[PDB]
């Protein structure tokens, strides 16, 4: 399916994070894809896993 | 968020009782209420829906009310097979919540447990380890103790219990309990016994076996 | 009949990432709404998520919001539970449900839960052990015997006998965890004494998160 | 009284 | 802390359960009192025999 650009940052975002392994960026970036509505959320979550694994 | 909260937490019965478990919502949920049952290894199980409505195939001696907050759900004739966990939960206001749960017993009477031991295999002998089993078979009530001896000293911290839940038809418990010791020291002592304790029995029963005996 | 089938619980390092599948049969997921609820020790039964399939409205628990997402495929009469950023206290059985369907504003059908266990620990398989029949565990003309299973690690594990056909008189214990923080169970059957060297007892045990599956036979010692 | 796996049922 | 207040429910017709009530001692008094006079609607005006400092109690209903 296709992204308006506020969704194609949030995945931009995910996608660069520096310290989460692969299995955890992809069920994030999954989960972008499942529930848009939810996209600050998990964009707020993988930041905090991101920072967490510094 | 609504609390939902249960009583009793335990409610022990003969078959043939009416029982009467409840339910209170932390505020108003009109009635957005339904009862759930949970049988050992089950998933949840509706019975009662909107507080007082019987889901189809609910046996008839399920009943539900609504009282304000206050929730009730009755049994009018308690049967072996409704020994279970019984929980509310409310869907007026997301989310939806449920109760703690109440537990319900059969009351029956006393059987005094078949007592059985099982010295170590002899696979697992050619590990390292060693499993003594004592095992208590179809007894009730569930309380009954078990004390492990070694050359006739009681054991402490190395045994652990496993209980099943109450029998579908019969309304009995078994248990088991394991002793682990490591090979060099079950090969190092004799005489292994279980000890039972139960208000069935006349007096406590202890049975043994020598290490080496066939 | 309708029907609600979860998968893809298993174990999981905290921090790491699950999805969970529920599919259902029987009826169209386009009618309902489809729930995730989960149950745990420390909570009890907790609402996890919603969906309601033919608009994609989604609702979540404050505790995994931003974690987990819920998703539907209508055209796979399929429901999802994504979970990410795992916690030790996710650590539940997963039950997907349906609410209103035909009418029926309760959840009225469960699936049988899968099990999601978040933990730093390994996957291990089990040694499967006989409690051998013997004058030690006979009286009345009928004897128990039986079948440790022993050290492994994580739940689940399930136990049949003669695969499914003996079923009367039998007792598979609750698991209980070792100080070693494996599992062990034990599953006794009781049987005639006069049965004993005739009819053959096996017990089939099947540790699945490590692909393990045993069929033991357990008979009397030899002397 | 807390849920327990095993036996999917409250353990006191 | 957690207490457990156990009750016996001692019904008009001889009939007995048992339940139990758990949480702070506060706690678990209101919920069996409240359980109590539930029942009482049924079964009849209830009398609470307080035993153990208030940890168990012995409740029976008059019909």
């Known amino acids: 399916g296709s992204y308006n650009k506020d969704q194609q940052s949030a995945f931009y975002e995910i996608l660069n994070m520096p310290n989460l392994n692969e299995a955890q960026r992809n069920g994030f970036i999954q989960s972008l894809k499942d529930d848009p509505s939810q996209s600050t959320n998990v964009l707020g979550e993988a930041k905090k896993l991101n920072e967490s694994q510094a | 968020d609504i609390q939902m909260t249960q009583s009793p937490i335990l409610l022990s019965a003969s078959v043939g009782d009416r029982v009467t478990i409840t339910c209170r919502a932390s505020?108003?949920?009109?009635?957005?209420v339904a009862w759930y049952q949970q049988r050992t290894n089950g998933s949840p199980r509706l019975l009662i829906y909107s507080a007082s409505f019987l889901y189809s195939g609910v046996p008839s001696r399920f009943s539900g009310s609504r009282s304000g907050t206050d929730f009730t759900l009755t049994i009018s004739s308690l049967q072996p097979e409704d020994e279970a966990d019984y929980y509310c939960q409310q869907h007026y206001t997301t989310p939806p919540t449920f109760g703690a749960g109440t537990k319900v017993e059969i009351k029956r009477t006393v059987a005094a447990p078949s007592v059985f031991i099982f010295p170590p295999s002899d696979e697992q002998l050619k590990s390292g380890t060693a499993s003594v089993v004592c095992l208590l078979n179809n007894f009730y009530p569930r309380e009954a103790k078990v004390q492990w001896k070694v050359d006739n000293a009681l054991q402490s911290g190395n045994s652990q219990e496993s209980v099943t839940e109450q029998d579908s038809k019969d309304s009995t418990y078994s248990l088991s309990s394991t002793l682990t010791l490591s090979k060099a020291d079950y090969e190092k002592h004799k005489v292994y016994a279980c000890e039972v304790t139960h208000q069935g029995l006349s007096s406590p029963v202890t049975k043994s076996f020598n290490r080496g005996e066939c | 009949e309708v029907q609600l089938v979860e998968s893809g619980g298993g174990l999981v390092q905290p921090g790491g990432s699950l999805r969970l599948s529920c599919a259902a049969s029987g009826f169209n997921i386009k009618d309902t709404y489809i729930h995730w609820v989960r149950q745990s020790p420390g909570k009890g039964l907790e609402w996890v998520a919603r969906?309601?399939?033919?608009?994609?409205?989604?609702r979540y628990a404050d505790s995994v919001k931003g974690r987990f997402t819920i998703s539907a495929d209508t055209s796979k009469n399929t429901a999802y539970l994504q979970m990410n950023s795992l916690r030790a206290e996710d650590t539940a059985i997963y039950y997907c449900?349906?609410?209103?369907?035909?009418?029926?504003?309760?959840?009225?059908?469960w699936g049988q839960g899968t099990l999601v266990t978040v933990s730093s620990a390994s996957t291990k398989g089990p040694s499967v052990f006989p409690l051998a029949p013997s004058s030690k565990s006979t009286s009345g003309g009928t004897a128990a015997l039986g079948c440790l299973v022993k050290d492994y690690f994580p739940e689940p594990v399930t136990v049949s006998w003669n695969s499914g056909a003996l079923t009367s008189g039998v007792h598979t214990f609750p698991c209980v965890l070792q100080s070693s923080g494996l599992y062990s169970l034990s599953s006794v059957v009781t049987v005639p004494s006069s049965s004993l060297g005739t009819q053959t007892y096996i017990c089939n045990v099947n540790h699945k998160p490590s692909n393990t599956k045993v069929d033991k036979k357990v008979e009397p010692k030899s002397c | 009284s807390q849920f327990d796996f095993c036996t999917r049922r409250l353990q006191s | 802390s957690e207490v457990t207040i156990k009750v016996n429910l001692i019904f008009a017709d001889g009939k007995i359960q048992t339940a139990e009530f758990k949480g702070t001692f506060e706690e678990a008094t209101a919920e069996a009192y409240r359980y109590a006079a539930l029942l009482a609607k049924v079964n009849g005006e209830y009398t609470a025999d307080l035993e153990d400092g208030g940890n168990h109690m012995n409740i029976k209903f008059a019909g």
């Open positions: 505020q108003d949920v009109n009635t957005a």
């Open positions: 969906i309601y399939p033919t608009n994609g409205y989604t």
């Open positions: 449900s349906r609410w209103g369907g035909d009418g029926f504003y309760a959840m009225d059908y």
